Amino acid sequence: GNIRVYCRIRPALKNLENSDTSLINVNEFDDNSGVQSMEVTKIQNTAQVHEFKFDKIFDQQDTNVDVFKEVGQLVQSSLDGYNVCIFAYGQTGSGKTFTMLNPGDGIIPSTISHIFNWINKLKTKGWDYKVNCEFIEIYNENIVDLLRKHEIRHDQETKTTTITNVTSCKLESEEMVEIILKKANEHSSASHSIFIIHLSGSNAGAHSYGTLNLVDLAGSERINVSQVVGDRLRETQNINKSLSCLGDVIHALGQPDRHIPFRNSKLTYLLQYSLTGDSKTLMFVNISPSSSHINETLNSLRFASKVNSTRLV
Ligand SMILES: Nc1ncnc2c1ncn2[C@@H]1O[C@H](COP(=O)(O)OP(=O)(O)O)[C@@H](O)[C@H]1O
Numbered sequence: 154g155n156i157r158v159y160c161r162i163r164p165a166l167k168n169l170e171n172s173d174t175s176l177i178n179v180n181e182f183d184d185n186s187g188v189q190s191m192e193v194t195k196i197q198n199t200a201q202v203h204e205f206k207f208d209k210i211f212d213q214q215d216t217n218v219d220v221f222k223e224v225g226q227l228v229q230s231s232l233d234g235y236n237v238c239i240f241a242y243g244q245t246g247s248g249k250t251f252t253m254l255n256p257g258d259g260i261i262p263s264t265i266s267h268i269f270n271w272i273n274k275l276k277t278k279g280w281d282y283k284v285n286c287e288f289i290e291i292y293n294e295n296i297v298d299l300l301r302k303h304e305i306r307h308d309q310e311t312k313t314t315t316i317t318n319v320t321s322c323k324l325e326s327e328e329m330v331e332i333i334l335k336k337a338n339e340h341s342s343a344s345h346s347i348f349i350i351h352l353s354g355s356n357a358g359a360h361s362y363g364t365l366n367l368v369d370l371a372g373s374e375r376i377n378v379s380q381v382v383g384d385r386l387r388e389t390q391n392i393n394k395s396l397s398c399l400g401d402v403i404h405a406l407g408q409p410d411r412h413i414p415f416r417n418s419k420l421t422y423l424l425q426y427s428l429t430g431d432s433k434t435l436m437f438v439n440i441s442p443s444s445s446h447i448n449e450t451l452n453s454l455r456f457a458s459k460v461n462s463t464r465l466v
């Protein structure tokens with residue numbers, strides 16, 4: 154499958170955070186090989202250096218605008234009929250929401266503005282594009298309509314998916330996404346939030362349809378399941394299973410050949426058609442640069458490495 158992995162280190166919160174007991178070193182992108190590497194070391198044992206390689210590594214100097222310079226090329230492929238998935242993964246506090254939802258800057262608002270710029274540019278070629286979206290969340294494996302039964306309906310014919318009784322909204326201009334985001338708006342830290350965009354183009358005779366799924370995943374922090382109870386226990390179990398399944402599915406899709414467990418989780422089942430075929434997927438792993446989070450950071454980088462496809466690994 155067409156999969157890529159980016160890592161992003163957010164700036165440290167000053168005076169409140171520090172890197173006194175660990176080191177995260179990011180190397181310059183290697184034009185010759187097409188990948189970027191980094192090394193993580195814990196002060197308790199500096200002899201053990203954990204190295205990782207990804208398609209791109211954004212450091213603390215990389216702003217949301219800098220990040221989209223890479224992401225724009227991916228999301229525009231939806232105008233050609235490609236389905237696109239972008240997953241922001243990382244512990245709570247690592248920067249997933251800032252990356253995906255920062256006002257005007259986030260991958261979501263940026264994606265919408267970029268698509269409309271392209272839509273206007275494609276009119277000269279006789280293309281007429283219509284845009285509609287949905288904004289849902291999956292919590293404890295249940296779908297919730299943030300723009301408000303919800304059953305997943307896979308159309309094996311057109312290889313598309315819809316969800317019953319979920320509000321869908323037209324987007325006639327990039328400025329309208331404001332109403333959507335405003336409507337939709339801790340809990341979100343324990344759920345997967347999914348912004349779905351459908352691009353329907355007609356050239357009065359070519360036709361094209363592509364879907365973008367921009368996901369802000371539930372926090373990946375490791376919670377000792379043996380130490381939680383009640384609602385916390387149930388959510389931990391569901392987040393663990395869901396994230397584990399996602400990793401397994403993406404890893405399998407990146408292999409040269411298999412029984413991909415799409416049905417093992419609500420998120421992967423919902424997105425199966427946007428994860429298969431010639432669909433393009435980008436895993437965005439957010440990490441903190443600080444020492445207090447080094448263990449979770451290593452966990453996140455290990456997840457990122459697992460989802461790296463055999464294009465790189
Ligand atoms: N790239 C960034 N640049 C500046 N601040 C950031 C960046 N990423 C995260 N932050 C800040 O770090 C904190 C973590 O934010 P958030 O995105 O909500 O994390 P998460 O969604 O992973 O739990 C916030 O106060 C946010 O404003």
Ligand SMILES: Nc1ncnc2c1ncn2[C@@H]1O[C@H](COP(=O)(O)OP(=O)(O)O)[C@@H](O)[C@H]1O
Pocket residue numbers: 155156157158223224226227433434435436
């Ligand atoms: N799976 C993907 N994830 C993230 N970005 C992608 C993906 N596929 C393509 N892109 C984006 O589109 C650009 C070029 O697309 P592609 O035809 O695959 O050429 P290249 O070989 O340079 O990646 C990339 O530089 C990247 O920014």
Ligand SMILES: [Mg+2]
Pocket residue numbers: 249250251341342369
């Ligand atoms: Mg968040």
